[PDB]
Design a protein around this ligand. Sequence first.
Ligand SMILES: *[C@H](O)[C@H](C[C@@H]1CCNC1=O)NC(=O)[C@@H]1[C@@H]2[C@H](CN1C(=O)OC(c1ccc(F)cc1)c1ccc(F)cc1)C2(C)C
Ligand SMILES: *[C@H](O)[C@H](C[C@@H]1CCNC1=O)NC(=O)[C@@H]1[C@@H]2[C@H](CN1C(=O)OC(c1ccc(F)cc1)c1ccc(F)cc1)C2(C)C
Lengths: 306, 306
Amino acid sequence: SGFRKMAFPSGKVEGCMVQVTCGTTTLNGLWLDDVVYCPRHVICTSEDMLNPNYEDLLIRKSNHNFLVQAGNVQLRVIGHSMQNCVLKLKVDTANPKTPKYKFVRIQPGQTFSVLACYNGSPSGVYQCAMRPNFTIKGSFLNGSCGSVGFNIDYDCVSFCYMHHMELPTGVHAGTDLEGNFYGPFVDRQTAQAAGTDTTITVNVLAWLYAAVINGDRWFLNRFTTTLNDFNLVAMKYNYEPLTQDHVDILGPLSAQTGIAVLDMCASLKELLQNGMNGRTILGSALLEDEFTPFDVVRQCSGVTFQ
Amino acid sequence: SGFRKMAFPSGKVEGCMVQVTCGTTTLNGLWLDDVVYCPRHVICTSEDMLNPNYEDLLIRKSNHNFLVQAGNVQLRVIGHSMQNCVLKLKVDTANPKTPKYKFVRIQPGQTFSVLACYNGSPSGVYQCAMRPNFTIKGSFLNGSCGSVGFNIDYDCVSFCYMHHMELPTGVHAGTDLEGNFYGPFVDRQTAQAAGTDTTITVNVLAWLYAAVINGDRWFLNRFTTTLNDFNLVAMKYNYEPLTQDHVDILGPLSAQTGIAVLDMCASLKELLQNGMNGRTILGSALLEDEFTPFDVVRQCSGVTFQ
Ligand SMILES: *[C@H](O)[C@H](C[C@@H]1CCNC1=O)NC(=O)[C@@H]1[C@@H]2[C@H](CN1C(=O)OC(c1ccc(F)cc1)c1ccc(F)cc1)C2(C)C
Ligand SMILES: *[C@H](O)[C@H](C[C@@H]1CCNC1=O)NC(=O)[C@@H]1[C@@H]2[C@H](CN1C(=O)OC(c1ccc(F)cc1)c1ccc(F)cc1)C2(C)C
């Protein structure tokens, strides 16, 4: 038993991390087969980053302007091209540690693991959710751009995120691995604001089911509610509306615990209207919304990856 | 910016994880050079695990009773011996992925990363603290024994923990890598209770400094307090006493923020006596105590590992 925010083992990604330097900018790249992927603002200087024209900037660059460091082994760049907001640096060596991988784009509400990196060297690993407003609440300092987010399915790494920037509220924005930003953001050093967020309702319910499975039961009750009446309360407390597909996704967790989904909604309603009265749930005094139903099933059942 | 519970990159440990099967028991082993380390209760059956005599049980075993699986490659056991509560299985192949390592024993209050494993395959990674009562609040299911806890210093892995068992309260107990239990526990399936816990005071203060560095300032105040007067309040709220060495350890974080250690103690005093009044600190509605001063400095400064 126990429930703990859990990242995927990072080994398969650690072997893809390299350092990319151009001029005065150093950041991380992702080395798969004979291509290194990295944020395109590596071609910029400081007075470039205020209002850059990246096509213009790139045509003035040379293969030899890009210094790629794979540990203490230098990789010669033999081609370069821009794909949306990422650079693709074609190198003369295929990464012998390339895992099976896919480039996927995730949905708000979904989680992934982040391998934070500096100077091409992994620093730590942690779990993040994509917020409804397409930001993530990460931990990123200068030099961390090019760190990636990912999920692992047996032996296949599904890369979903590359880090590019921090917004004024301290939250983080980036792209998928095809270089397309999550949310209405641009890779320019200007005033951009996140947009209003909401709480991921289906995830809170998943986490309540994780709590029951682990023996926290105090918030349960005999009451029930209809889906429509629950959603009237959700809107009040800035929670996302619950759909029948969410109810279906929660089916297995309902069946394991014997607590009907709409019954757990009645529990959530009471928690929203009353607070917790000084009690905790799975060691938290807040309703947690960054665990998906799959995250709960994986951890409360123990799936691995080889 | 941002502050997030962060594990070390797990790659160096992933390459040491193997599967050990004896009779009907399967668990994980740690393969370093030509030795596999694993919990000694792998030699047990169910009616062994109630009150086992492990010397007796081991003399009845054979090298060939131990099936060691390194992925899909079987390792022949050529010797076996017991060291306290761990088994050392001498195998005919040295692990070519053996990192530089040390076996260290940690202190309550210290943190480490856990690579949870099943059937020799890594499942997830997360950060844990050793509680003052020598338990850890982990996430472990059946088959997870032999998973290890560790810290990484540049390129050296300091193994500090091997998982053995879950207590009735849902917390977890295990040994150092020399097989000596943390706390007053034995590897027997009997009634053992954790012992009363306390809150790690120096870590809470470190986390308050992480909050200030990240812009949470509402809990600050002009008040101050003496170390003695703070400790009168700590004892009331079941917090550990603060020592001058804790104050010294917090010195660098004090200097960075310009907030004297004893001033932050006055803030903690107020938080203990008043609660939070519906506010949060670093996304938490509880005072968090599983970040060390070193964890805060590493993350709020960005140290890596190669
Ligand atoms: C890449 O390593 C870097 C990662 C940032 C640095 C701090 N935390 C991170 O996640 N990315 C950037 O520096 C990008 C890059 C420039 C600007 N930028 C950025 O993150 O935004 C900064 C900013 C400055 C002023 C504003 F009005 C808005 C945003 C920024 C924010 C915090 C901070 F500590 C430093 C810089 C661009 C987008 C090309
Ligand atoms: C090894 O994989 C296993 C890991 C445990 C299983 C569940 N969570 C874990 O961390 N370790 C054990 O099974 C050890 C092993 C037997 C008993 N044991 C154990 O964890 O304690 C169990 C227990 C049963 C009855 C009690 F009165 C106390 C303890 C236990 C607790 C929870 C659970 F789901 C299953 C079993 C020993 C110590 C040799």
